[PDB]
Amino acid sequence: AAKYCKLPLRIGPCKRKIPSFYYKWKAKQCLPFDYSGCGGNANRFKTIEECRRTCVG
Structure with missing residues (x-):
């Protein structure tokens, strides 16, 4: 776990698509x-x- 792990599903307002993982x-x-x-x-x-x-572990 880390402070920023709380940040939500932030796709960000650009018109691209790059497969990633978030928490x-x-x-x-x-x-x-x-x-x-x-x-x-x-x-x-x-x-x-x-x-x-x-985040886990």
């Missing part, structure tokens, strides 16, 4: 999604395992 703190798990590129947050991982290893 839905409002559920309590790491989930796949598409990031845009712009205006995201720290709650963003290329792998489930890095998300998991950051």
